[PDB]
Structures are given as C-alpha cells and as structure tokens.
Amino acid sequence: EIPKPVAPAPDILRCAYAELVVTDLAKSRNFYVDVLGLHVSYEDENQIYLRSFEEFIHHNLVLTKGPVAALKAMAFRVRTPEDVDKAEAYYQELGCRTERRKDGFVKGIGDALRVEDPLGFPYEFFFETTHVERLHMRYDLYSAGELVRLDHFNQVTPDVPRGRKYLEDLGFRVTEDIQDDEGTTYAAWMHRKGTVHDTALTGGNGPRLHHVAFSTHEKHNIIQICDKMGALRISDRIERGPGRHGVSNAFYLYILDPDNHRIEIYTQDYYTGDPDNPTITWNVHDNQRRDWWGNPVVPSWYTEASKVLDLDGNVQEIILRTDDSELEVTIGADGFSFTRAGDEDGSYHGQASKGFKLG
Amino acid sequence: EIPKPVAPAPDILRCAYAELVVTDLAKSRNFYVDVLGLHVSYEDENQIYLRSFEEFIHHNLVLTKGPVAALKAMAFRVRTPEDVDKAEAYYQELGCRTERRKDGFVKGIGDALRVEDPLGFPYEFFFETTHVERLHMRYDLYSAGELVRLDHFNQVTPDVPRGRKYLEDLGFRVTEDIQDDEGTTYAAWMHRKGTVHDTALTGGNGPRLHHVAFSTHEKHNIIQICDKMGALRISDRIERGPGRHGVSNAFYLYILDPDNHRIEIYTQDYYTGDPDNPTITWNVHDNQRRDWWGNPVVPSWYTEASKVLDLDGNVQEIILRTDDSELEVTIGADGFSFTRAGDEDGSYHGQASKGFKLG
Amino acid sequence: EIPKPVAPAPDILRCAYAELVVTDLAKSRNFYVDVLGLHVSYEDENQIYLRSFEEFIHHNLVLTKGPVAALKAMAFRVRTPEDVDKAEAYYQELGCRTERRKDGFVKGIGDALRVEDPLGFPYEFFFETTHVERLHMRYDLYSAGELVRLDHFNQVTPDVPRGRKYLEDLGFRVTEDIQDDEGTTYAAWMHRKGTVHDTALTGGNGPRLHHVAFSTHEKHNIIQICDKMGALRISDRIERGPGRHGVSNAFYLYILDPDNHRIEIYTQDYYTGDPDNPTITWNVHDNQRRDWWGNPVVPSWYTEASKVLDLDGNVQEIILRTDDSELEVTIGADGFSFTRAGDEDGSYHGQASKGFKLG
Amino acid sequence: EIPKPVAPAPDILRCAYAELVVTDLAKSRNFYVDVLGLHVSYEDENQIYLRSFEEFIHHNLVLTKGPVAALKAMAFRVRTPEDVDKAEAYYQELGCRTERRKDGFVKGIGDALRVEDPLGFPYEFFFETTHVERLHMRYDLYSAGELVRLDHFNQVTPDVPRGRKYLEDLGFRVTEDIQDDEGTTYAAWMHRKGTVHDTALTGGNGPRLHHVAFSTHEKHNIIQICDKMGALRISDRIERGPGRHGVSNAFYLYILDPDNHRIEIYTQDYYTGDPDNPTITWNVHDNQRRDWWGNPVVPSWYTEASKVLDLDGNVQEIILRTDDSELEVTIGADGFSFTRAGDEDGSYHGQASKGFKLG
Numbered sequence A, B, C, D: 001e002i003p004k005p006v007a008p009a010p011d012i013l014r015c016a017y018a019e020l021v022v023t024d025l026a027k028s029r030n031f032y033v034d035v036l037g038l039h040v041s042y043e044d045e046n047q048i049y050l051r052s053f054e055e056f057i058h059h060n061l062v063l064t065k066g067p068v069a070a071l072k073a074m075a076f077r078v079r080t081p082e083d084v085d086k087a088e089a090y091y092q093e094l095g096c097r098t099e100r101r102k103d104g105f106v107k108g109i110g111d112a113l114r115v116e117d118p119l120g121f122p123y124e125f126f127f128e129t130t131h132v133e134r135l136h137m138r139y140d141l142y143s144a145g146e147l148v149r150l151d152h153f154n155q156v157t158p159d160v161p162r163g164r165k166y167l168e169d170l171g172f173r174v175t176e177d178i179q180d181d182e183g184t185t186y187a188a189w190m191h192r193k194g195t196v197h198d199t200a201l202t203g204g205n206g207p208r209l210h211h212v213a214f215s216t217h218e219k220h221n222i223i224q225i226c227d228k229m230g231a232l233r234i235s236d237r238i239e240r241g242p243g244r245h246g247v248s249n250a251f252y253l254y255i256l257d258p259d260n261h262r263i264e265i266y267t268q269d270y271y272t273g274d275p276d277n278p279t280i281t282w283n284v285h286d287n288q289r290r291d292w293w294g295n296p297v298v299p300s301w302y303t304e305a306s307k308v309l310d311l312d313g314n315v316q317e318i319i320l321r322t323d324d325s326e327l328e329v330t331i332g333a334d335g336f337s338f339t340r341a342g343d344e345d346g347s348y349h350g351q352a353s354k355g356f357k358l359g
C-alpha cells in the first residue's frame, strides 16, 4: 500500500554506514575502539568516525554526541552521483520529507540526501566519499576479534509486508523470511550487495533500529569478542549468542553498547547475487530458525531496540504492532516451538527451549 | 572422613575409558558413530568398543546393551602391571568390595581390578590393553567434528570435601574449585595427567555420573558438532552450550545420548603438571565461573545425571546432598549471581542471567 | 586493438561452471568426489556433474571423458534470458565463431551460447539452469575440507593489456595487477560479482587454462585438504602453498588433478563491488606479491597450464608470449626480487627466496 | 658411550625457560614483545624476562645483552627442591662441570644448578621460581598470534645415538626418530611432560642450539604470525613453513630473531604420557617426514644453528658430525626422497621437492 513511484529507484550498492547518537562520547569510544577494535578515521570532542579493517570509504560508523541516544541516519551508497538525484525524485514522489546537502551531513561524505522514509526511518543516499587507507593487509593492526566489514542494518517496524513491498520497489531482493500458517509475517531479510542482506525488517513497535552488524573473517574471531568481554568483566553486555543462525546460516553474536545500541557480529552467510536466488521461508514455531542449535532467543532481543530521529533531530513517533508477536507465539505463556514439525518430543509449550521461562 | 591407607596408592596415569550400559545398541551406535564420528575397535550384537582419533589403547568407550542405562565402570590406566595389585591392596584396606579379572572385564583389556569405591562409584584400574592403529594422522578419516582424545569424567557426589580428600590421597591434585563465603564447596576438579582434570566432583545427590568428556583440536570442531545436530534435527539433544568455561578455561558443549547419558566436548584448557600449580577458587555466585560469557546454566545440568552400577550390575542407591544446592543459590527463586563483585549492576536476583527464569 | 562493439555487452553475473575434459573418468571421480568432497548432481559413464556446498544451480564442474585433457568451456551466468541474445550479438560483432544451443551443451543448462573468444578461449554464456537442493546447511554432509563455492577462473594469455581491454569492455572491472617500472604487465585480476575476481589473466604462452578456484569457509579447511593429501600419500599433487596471497589477500593452495588440471582452494578475499573500488598495482619484483610470506613460487606454476578446446573439440594452438617472463625476471638466472624496495638485505638475485634455486 | 650414573636422575618436569644472549636488547625486545607479543615479567637495561600467555612461573625466556649471541642456558624445572641436589650429584658422577647458586643465576629463579653437560650444552635445573599472574584468561591482552606455552628445545649434536642414550638415562622417553636403512640416526625426539618432546636431537656439528619452540592454541594463530611479518615487511625472517610436521604431527613455523636465533611456533601434537607410548621411526628419504605436505626443507634449516656458551660465558667449540648428513642424503646433489616408498613417481633425485634445487 506504499505506491510504486513512476520515478526510477536509485541504484543502491550496499549499506555503507550508520550515524548513532551517543550520550557519553568517551564511554562510547572505549566500547567501539578499545573493546571492539574499530579504526579511527577522524575524531574530535563531538564525533568519532570509525571504519572496519577492509573498508576504503571514509567510515562505517559515526558516533555523534547528543542528548538522546538514537539512530540519526542509516546510509546506503549508490552507484553514481546521478543516483543521488534519482533518490531525491523517488522519495519526493512518495511524499516523504527530504534534505539535500551538497557538502554532506558528516565528514568524509560529499553530496548526500537524507529522507524520512515511508516507515519513518532516516535513510541517507550518497555516492561521493573520501577514500582512506584500506587496512585489509595491515596485519600489524589486526586484533584477535577484528571486525572486517559492515554487513547490514536491521529495522523494527509494525507491518512487515508493507515495508517489504516498499523495499522491493526500491530494489532490495528478499532472501529469507519468517511466517506462520495463518499468514502473519514476523521478519524479512533483503539485499543489494549479494549477501543475505543489507537491511532487514523485524516485526515490532517502530520505527526503531534493531541493530547494526559487522563481519569477521572467522568464527573464532567472534568467540574472542565474547572471551574479551568476559576478561573485561562486561559479560552482562553480551545479550544473545554466540550461535549459528537458521535464517542466513551466519555465525553470530549480539552485544550492547553503553547507550544500549545493539551491535551484531556476523560471519559466513551465503551468496545471493543471482536474480532467481531461492527464497527461504521458515515457520515461526521452528525452534531452529533463529538459533540453529535451538538455544532460546532472549526476550530483550524481541522487545528492545533504539529510537530513531527525524530530520530535525527529534525522536520519531513509535507505532504499536498489531500483528502477532514473535515472542508471544513462541516463548510466551501461550506460545510454542518445535524441533521437528509435528513431534511433541523436543517441543516447548509456554516457555523457551533448554529449560527456561521468561524472567 | 575416608581414612588414608598405609598401603601405597596405585600410580594413576589418566582416565582411559568408560563402560556405559545402553538400552538400544543400534540407536546408541547411531549417536556415537554416525553423529559423533567415534572409531569402532570392535562390535557385536551386545557391545560396541569405540576410540578417539589419537588413541592407541583398545578403546575409550564401551557401549554395553542392558536393561537399565547406567555407568558400569570408569576406568583409569595405571603406570605398571604392579599398580593393579597396589590398587587391590589399597581398596581392600579401605574396606571396599573389589573384583579382579586376570583377563579383563571387557575386550582389549588385560588384568583389571574393579572396585565399589568409598563414594559408591565403579572404578576400574588396569595396565594391560591391546594396542590398535593410532589414527592421529589418518586425515582421510578426519571428521569436521573429530573427537581426538578422552579428557575426563565428572562425578555427582553429595559431600565434595569428603570425596576431595579421598581423591587427593589417591594422588589426584586439585586444580580448581567452586566455594562460597560460608564454607560450602560446590565442585572440585582434579588431575593426574597434567590437564585441568581427569575426574571432577559436582555437588549433588549421588553416586551419579555427570558426564564423560572428549576433546577436539579446535573450537570450530565443537561448532561443527552443534551445526551437524541442527542438520539432523536433533538440536533438542544439545543440552548446554557451546561456551567458554570459567573454571578450566576450555571451550565446551554438552549433548545427551539416546539414554540421556551426558557427553561433554571440550578443548584448550591449560597445563597443570607442576606440583605447585596454582589452585583457583571461584565464588559460587560469580556468573562467569561456569560460562565465562555469563550465559545461564541450564537447570537440567544441575539436576540430571546417570545412574551408576555396583559390581553385581544393580543400580547404586542415591544418597541426598544436604549441603546448599548450586542451582538454588544461583538461579533458584532465592538465588543470586553477579557479573562484577560488589556491583548491583549486572547482578541477578531470583533468576538466571540473560532474562530467563527456571522453567 | 580488440575493438569495442556497438552492441551492448551481456550483463554477466559471475563465473558459474567449468567443463573439463578428463582421460580416466573413474580416476577423476576419485579426486573430485573422494578426495575433495564435491557433490554429485548427475553422473553416467561419460560425465560427472559436481557442485559446491552452497550452490543452487545444477553444477559448478562437469568432468567429460575425452581423448585429450583440456578445458572444454568456462561458463558465466548472465542476468536474464535476453543477455544470451546480447552475448551472441556482441561476439558476432567481434568476428568470433559462436554456437547457440536452445537446450544447452551439458545437462542442467538451458539456452546457451558458446564462443571461441578473441583470446582463443571457449567461453559459455547462459541464464537457464536446473535448480537443485542448496546444501548450505547440510552439516551432516559437511567435510573438514568442504569446498563451498566456485570462485574464479585463471587464464594464461600472451598479451595481458590486450586481453584486459577486451574484458573491461565486456564489463569486468580490474581490481589488482602486476607490472614493472618498464611498463610490462604480467597479470591482471577482474570481477563481476564483487569479489577480487571472476577471471584473471596470467602472462604466458596461450590460450591455456591456469586453474579453476573453489572457496572454503575458513583457513583450517584448506589446511585439512593438505593434511588429507598427506594421509593419502599424494602430497606430490600439492603444487604450491598453502599460503597467503599478496594480490587478493586470500589464503590459498594449488593442487593437481589426475590430468594435471590445476585447482586452487581459496578463502577470505575482500569486497570489490563499489564502482570506484581502488585498483592495486604490485611491482613484479616484490617478493610478497604472490606469496605474502615470501615463499618461493614453484617454477611449474609459471610454466604449466591446461590446453583449451575450440568449438569442434580440437586443441587450440599456443601463441608464445614475447613480453618479459615473470619467472625469468624474478627467479631465473638474471632475475631478482626484494622484501623491502631498495634494500639488498632480503633481496634475491638469480634464485628464488628461502635458499632455493630452480630445479 | 656415556655411562649411566649410580646416582638417581633428577625428576624433570618439563622444559621451563631459555636464557639467550642477544647483541642489541632494544631490537630483540621489538621482535619478542612487539612482533611476537610475549609478556614482560621484568626488564631493565641488561635483560628482558618474558613469559607466555598461560605461564605461572616467572619466565619462559630471558634475553641477556652480551657481546656474542648464543644460548646461555636451557632450563628444566624439577619436581622438588631435593631434585636440584640429585642433579648436582648426577652430573658430578658424570664428571661434568657444575655450578650451584642458592639464589639463582637469573631473576625469579631460586636455588639452581647449571652444568656443562656431556654433549657440551648449558643445562640448568631448578625448582624454586617466583610465581606471577597466570594470564591464561586475560583475553583483553590476547594477540591474534598469541604464544601460550613454552613447548621444547631442539639441540644440534654430532652423534644422535650417543646423546639419545644419555637423555634416556636422564629420564626422557623417545617418542619419534628418523633413521635410514643403513643404521644411521639423523634425529630423535624425547619427552618428560607428556607431549611429543621437551627436547630433541638434530644430527649436525655441535653443540649448537637449533631452536626454542612456543605453542599457540590454534593453527590460525600461526598463520597470523606469518601475516603480521608480511605486514611489517620482515617476511625474510620467516625461514621455513608454515606447515604440518610428519614427526610430531604438529602445525609449525620457523622464524629468525635479530641475532638469527631460530624460534619455532608449534601447535597440536599428541599425548605421549603412557609409558608404553608407541615409538615412531621415519625413514630419512620419506619426503613427508618433516613437512607432511612434502614441501622442501630449507637448506639453512640443516646448516644454521646458534652458538652455546660454557659456564665462563665462552662459546663451546664445535665438533663435526661424521655420520651422514640429512641435507646431503635428501636434497643434496646425490640426495633422494620419495612420496610413496618404492614408487619412482613422486620421487626426487639430486634436488628438493616441488621443483627446487639447493641455492
């Protein structure tokens, strides 16, 4: 019910960076630099610009000091300077608020368009960016937990099919989703760059930002992040994992930054770049869909997510999801999940797997 | 208190094998051979003899068909044939029932002594064993989840200090333990071979066998076992993990065989062979002690363990623990755990970590 | 010198499969299925169709029994059925011999175009292919050395700049190359799918096929392949490696099949999908350009490669390279290489690194 | 022949540390600390004391500034303080020069005996050592190339059987060796701590120290060391590897410190603690004995080794080997090696494997 514009979609390459507003810049720096090992492209008393090991654009993450922690912008790189004009035309036809800045909104980005999209998310589209030293062979800097690439964003929105259509019109291709037999959709994953996703929609009250994900080379790198957090005695900031995903098949970990922005560490999903890439739909009650090993999904993973800002820097209104809740139908008092479809053995009723109930 | 014999202790080398009684031999074979990749030394309609990748003695695990699933014997290899006589003399002085078989109790073992030890456990001591092809460079057989060694046993016993003193007199050296500030001991780890342990005591109703542990070379091998279990749609048989242990520092996984016998997969603990190896005591309320990443300990891990048999093949009666319960004091309704000692932030009152309560 | 056609280039997605002629089908099957663990999509007495772990198209490799071992076709998948028509028009404009088969040249491929390209290589373009079960989460089938994707081809051609221009016009983007200060180009790498390459040009006598490359998830998987070849006592079929590439930054291994077709195993190169991806040029004398650790490049790696066929099944005549030889200028009697530019310490003159000369 | 003393051998636990004389302390610090990540236990202007990640004794390596780079002492820890007395009596009965210091030769060591042993090597025996923080869970300090333990020494000596008998009398157990069909022994490996070795003898002119070896947890940690040396543009200091050993089965790498002291990085050998541990003899012409993958052994690996000092700090005179040279018989002009015994295919005559000759 979001209409398809007559205007052509901008050619989107990939997710490129997020700008997160943080309340204590020093504490945030400790987390992203000292704990996680991201590389400083620029910093001052107001902002920190960070990039992953293999990145050549200026940054994958901007930490901006502000009064209220929130997503300020989720930025996608487009293929040509002309695609920025295409983005402006497209969103204007959709009736969305847009703001164009020839000199960019943040350092290291040139001509850029920010929009309040039809789902209420602050999207940025840009082509021009300052190239920096690509650190991909700087093994003298490589940490045991090295984050090598920015992989994806994940957005919380109340109406998944509505957002899905809009993103498909924008050119994203759906790779996987979670539905039930009653026809409710709980989540969808969609890509531009030929991995499982560049962004994803998670059913819930929104707009809110669920997480930003970075890649590692190997599974042991993700294990090391966990181990380091234990050594630093901040294991309470490990939210969920590590595990193997069902959807995406990636090895994963979720952690919480000082403002409770959720960061995923992710590795080893599969190639999706063929236009007839087979879509995979999982049943919501399948206990292997989110954690392949059947480990329970922590309730905060379903309930907590970051505020997002509008173009004035104010927090966007949040709309209540009315479709069924994934938490409620799977691990809530009236929920259930299964290990084998139709088998009562290895099924869980009114609680989570592995012997746990909701706290 | 268990008295220290005048008779010298047998010189114990290491844990060597366990004999488990199973109810359906074919189903057990599916689990240990097809799922886990253990190597068959001998089998018939009654027994299956299995060994790990780097083993040169006949077997590390004997599966015996029987009416009641239980541990039949935990076996330790001794240094010399004369140590079998030393074990006989030792246990006779302790007033324990012993049985001696010059040609062994199981195939591929020679002169062997089985005892009902002071804690009610069926111990075996042997030297003589049939050597087999050591498969350590048979990379043509190497599985993505290859189990390379037998590492340890873990025993459930009601009175940990009582058992600890007995095992110390036997020559085992304590490497780590869990205590509280009120004089209660919850668990102890003890070795002969220079790893963290060859056996361990876990406080609880006993005698019961908590688990048998096998090692892999690398952490990814353990991940693969989990992954394979999800592919076989038996993720319900993954009990706990994978994780990083606090005590022992090993990467770990617990899975359940078809008779609910618990198997741990384990890797990368540290060297303990020096006689003044520093002992490490963890506080029971430290939420990083069992899983370093603070993931909750599944309640079945505290409550479930295997029956053990006497020398007549009858199940040993269960003596109740009267000391405080680790489950109750950490994750029960009146329990408590912390992330940082003295910090209310990251502490848990009357529930488990990560947002869960007992199911 | 190879002119740019007026007709538009077909939109090429990625390298998709190679068809290799082999002399003994059973022996080839032993190598690719038994040693390397590729998955059989179809086989009969004349052909074996194989795919990698994550593939959903019918196959990545066709082994065809024939009198003379050679490359029969290197196939690229195109975006739409119409791009096959575009491919036909494009190559007909170039004056190349083309053959079109509405029902394909091999099983599981539909409408297909094969061409004898300007460099004398048998290229195939197709869209239509039979989808098969994507094995990406079949961890019950996963090998310790599992080959997960087809990554690239590598072609030997006498004139690298000539081939480079042609491939760029065809839409490949150069990511890395090797040159010297005189202005000779020794090698170039070029992509469509957003990895370091889908094909590459190696300077030498040609047309010949240097290798076909498959990916693994992790570096340990490549180590396992070497270990397994040791156990099978076929270590003489390990040609070069394992190592870390300078160009591409990938961890690698080269092995030889029963007909001396070279196969590379490859993992963890970087993202190239942005249109302004920085192009890296290495100096031919840089001893870290091919193996980052400075290990010598085996002479057979520069001199040996597979014959290629024309459309009638006859071997293509070889044209000699007149440009300087990478072998000669680096490891030959009058060659040299350096560890640090301008430093004689760590330089090698008239021999290879690590204390070796040419055999 | 070296006679077996009447006096009992000291009970040796393990190799514990090496004291190396270096010419430029700062440069040596840059290598061991900044490149390799060893942990500083103590330093001043004359010496640097270093330990591995899991070590609790004071140090595994002492770097001592001096005029001539050499091994000053190879130290073994003994079981009790009385074993130092036993070591003194033992070497005194052997007619060896001994020096006893009640307060040690280096910091963090107590009562210590140094000897000029029968093969000319400076051995130390000690029990007393200052315990330090065991860093085994300090994942906040863990390097991507972390060295976790000291594993072994390797000694060059002209007569391997003579040295072997002496070490066996001292209580070391031979695990593997290399011989030919004409009765020549080229190398032997022997242990106390239950790994493949604590020291080893390599046939050649001696006494010289071949190398000191440290362990990592995993194979990727060794790969990272290579990658970091490439990044630092010191790949010319990678002498040999990385590879899989035949003898020992360990994954390995050899690198050279600023004074050309050879250091091995080593992981994942097997358990040898049983007293009937199967001994393994390899033929010297077996091309998988040293590198399992058949990669050629660098000639410098056979010819170069460190000087060793006597108790006055003077360099020990070299005695020439008269037995056949492993280099000459395998890779020399008249050498030979095989891949499969009895198979001419995959054999090498008068040159090294993989297409190389001696430089």
Ligand SMILES: O=C1C=CC(S(=O)(=O)O)=CC1(O)O
Residues within 6 Å of the ligand: A154, A200, A213, A245, A246, A247, A248, A250, A264, A266, A289, A290, A291
């Ligand atoms: O990156 C992702 C891929 C898969 C999943 S899921 O927990 O497996 O659904 C979570 C995620 O959405 O964050």
Ligand SMILES: O=C1C=CC(S(=O)(=O)O)=CC1(O)O
Residues within 6 Å of the ligand: C154, C200, C213, C245, C246, C247, C248, C250, C264, C266, C289, C290, C291
């Ligand atoms: O895949 C490749 C990537 C890099 C290299 S090179 O040996 O580093 O040039 C070789 C290769 O051309 O086969």
Ligand SMILES: [Ca+2]
Residues within 6 Å of the ligand: B180, B181, B182
């Ligand atoms: Ca208390």
Ligand SMILES: [Cl-]
Residues within 6 Å of the ligand: B245, B289, B290, B291
């Ligand atoms: Cl535990």
Ligand SMILES: [Cl-]
Residues within 6 Å of the ligand: D245, D289, D290, D291
């Ligand atoms: Cl070797």
Ligand SMILES: [Fe+2]
Residues within 6 Å of the ligand: A152, A153, A154, A211, A213, A264
């Ligand atoms: Fe995600």
Ligand SMILES: [Fe+2]
Residues within 6 Å of the ligand: B152, B153, B154, B211, B213, B264
């Ligand atoms: Fe255990």
Ligand SMILES: [Fe+2]
Residues within 6 Å of the ligand: C152, C153, C154, C211, C213, C264
């Ligand atoms: Fe390649």
Ligand SMILES: [Fe+2]
Residues within 6 Å of the ligand: D152, D153, D154, D211, D213, D264
């Ligand atoms: Fe060594």
